[PDB]
Design an enzyme around this catalytic site. Structure first.
Site, PDB file in Angstrom:
ATOM      1  N   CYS A   1       0.802  -1.218   0.000  1.00 27.53           N
ATOM      2  CA  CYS A   1       0.000   0.000   0.000  1.00 27.53           C
ATOM      3  C   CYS A   1       0.838   1.272   0.000  1.00 27.53           C
ATOM      4  O   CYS A   1       0.512   2.243   0.679  1.00 27.53           O
ATOM      5  CB  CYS A   1      -1.004  -0.004   1.147  1.00 27.53           C
ATOM      6  SG  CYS A   1      -2.430  -1.053   0.803  1.00 27.53           S
TER       7      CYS A   1
ATOM      8  N   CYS B   1      -0.978   0.731  10.933  1.00 28.88           N
ATOM      9  CA  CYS B   1      -0.921  -0.076   9.719  1.00 28.88           C
ATOM     10  C   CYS B   1      -1.947   0.413   8.702  1.00 28.88           C
ATOM     11  O   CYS B   1      -3.149   0.199   8.867  1.00 28.88           O
ATOM     12  CB  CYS B   1      -1.156  -1.547  10.053  1.00 28.88           C
ATOM     13  SG  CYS B   1      -1.445  -2.586   8.621  1.00 28.88           S
TER      14      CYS B   1
ATOM     15  N   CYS C   1       6.459  -3.171   9.130  1.00 26.64           N
ATOM     16  CA  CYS C   1       7.178  -1.920   8.934  1.00 26.64           C
ATOM     17  C   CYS C   1       7.496  -1.221  10.253  1.00 26.64           C
ATOM     18  O   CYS C   1       7.024  -1.634  11.318  1.00 26.64           O
ATOM     19  CB  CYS C   1       6.330  -0.995   8.062  1.00 26.64           C
ATOM     20  SG  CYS C   1       4.624  -0.845   8.636  1.00 26.64           S
TER      21      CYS C   1
HETATM   22  S1  SF4 Z   1       2.238  -3.346   8.860  1.00 23.79           S
HETATM   23 FE1  SF4 Z   1       0.662  -2.713   7.606  1.00 23.79          FE
HETATM   24  S2  SF4 Z   1       1.376  -0.929   6.740  1.00 23.79           S
HETATM   25 FE2  SF4 Z   1       3.066  -1.922   7.541  1.00 23.79          FE
HETATM   26  S3  SF4 Z   1       3.824  -3.059   5.941  1.00 23.79           S
HETATM   27 FE3  SF4 Z   1       2.513  -4.319   7.009  1.00 23.79          FE
HETATM   28  S4  SF4 Z   1       0.645  -4.115   6.037  1.00 23.79           S
HETATM   29 FE4  SF4 Z   1       1.854  -2.486   5.401  1.00 23.79          FE
END
Ligand code: SF4
Lengths: 73, 108, 106
Positions: free
Chosen positions: B50, B78, B69
């Protein structure tokens, strides 16, 4: 700003990765640490990290920040 | 896929370990997982599906947007809406997604 | 349906429209992209000939996504007279998008 500066956290930053509070909400504001890195590029190539200012605190605990969240001393 | 299955497991395990829940519209959860898997395949790491990247391969080596992340690990934010905090309205109450539904959205 | 826009059709469809433009920056494997898509589709009917609505696939057209420094997705960008007027990040509620449409009319 520049690597190795004393900075203060001057905004409500809530983290869940602090050793004293593992997996619990803990606000960072008012804390003081050193600018370890300003993430913008890997090998001269541009990167999209939205929290570029990495600050090392005590206990080798570190957190990423936006420039507007931290102030120099 | 074996990669999708690996990705599925990480999402399910990590969600439980962090007190986060999947979307009440599991097709959304399905999309993300599959996007993470596709990124796992071509890039090495499960780079967040995303965001737009000027350089995917450099992005994989700074590791910032490598799932989970930095924002999700430190601030629990997120934006793919894979890992939703309880207070979010899009947060369902499953922490498990059927292997079946993951292929259904790949066909859909 | 909301028409799609690429690298070669940007100037015309977006930058030169005499009516205000709302562009949906999306990606085939972004969760929230699936969520705003219906809302962007419903907002199209609601404002026919009042604003121009287009979808831009960041995978398909990476040149524009780069050009406007689109980073998080989905983003919704607003254009009046080829001027970048607004940037709303994420799976935006219809009301927020509605509130933004009004800000650009007559
Ligand atoms: S935690 Fe959420 S925002 Fe971060 S990489 Fe994973 S899916 Fe993407």
């Amino acid at each position: 700003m520049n690597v190795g500066d004393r900075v203060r956290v001057t905004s409500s930053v809530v983290v869940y990765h602090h050793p004293e509070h593992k997996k619990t909400a803990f606000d960072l504001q008012g804390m003081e640490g050193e600018v370890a890195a300003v993430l913008t590029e890997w090998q001269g190539r541009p990167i999209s990290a939205n929290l570029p200012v990495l600050v090392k605190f005590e206990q080798r605990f570190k957190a990423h920040f936006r420039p507007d969240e931290v102030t120099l001393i | 896929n074996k990669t999708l299955a690996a990705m599925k497991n990480f999402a399910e395990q990590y969600a439980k370990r962090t007190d986060t829940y999947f979307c009440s519209d599991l097709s959304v959860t399905a999309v993300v997982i599959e996007g993470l898997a596709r990124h796992k395949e071509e890039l090495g790491s499960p780079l967040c599906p995303c965001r737009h990247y000027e350089d995917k391969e450099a992005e994989v080596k700074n590791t910032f947007w490598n799932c989970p992340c930095v924002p999700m690990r430190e601030r629990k934010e997120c934006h793919c809406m894979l890992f939703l905090t309880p207070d979010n309205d899009f947060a369902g109450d499953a922490q498990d997604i059927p292997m079946e539904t993951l292929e259904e959205v790949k066909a859909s | 349906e909301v028409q799609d826009v690429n690298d070669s059709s940007w100037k015309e469809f977006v930058l030169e429209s005499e009516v205000p433009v709302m562009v949906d920056f999306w990606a085939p494997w972004c969760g929230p992209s699936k969520l705003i898509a219906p809302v962007i589709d419903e907002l199209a009917k609601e404002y026919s000939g009042k604003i121009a609505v287009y979808k831009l696939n960041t995978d398909e057209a990476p040149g524009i996504a780069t050009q406007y420094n689109i980073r998080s997705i989905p983003t919704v960008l607003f254009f009046k007279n080829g001027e970048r007027k607004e940037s709303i990040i994420g799976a935006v509620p219809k009301s927020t998008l509605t509130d933004s449409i009004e800000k650009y009319l007559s």
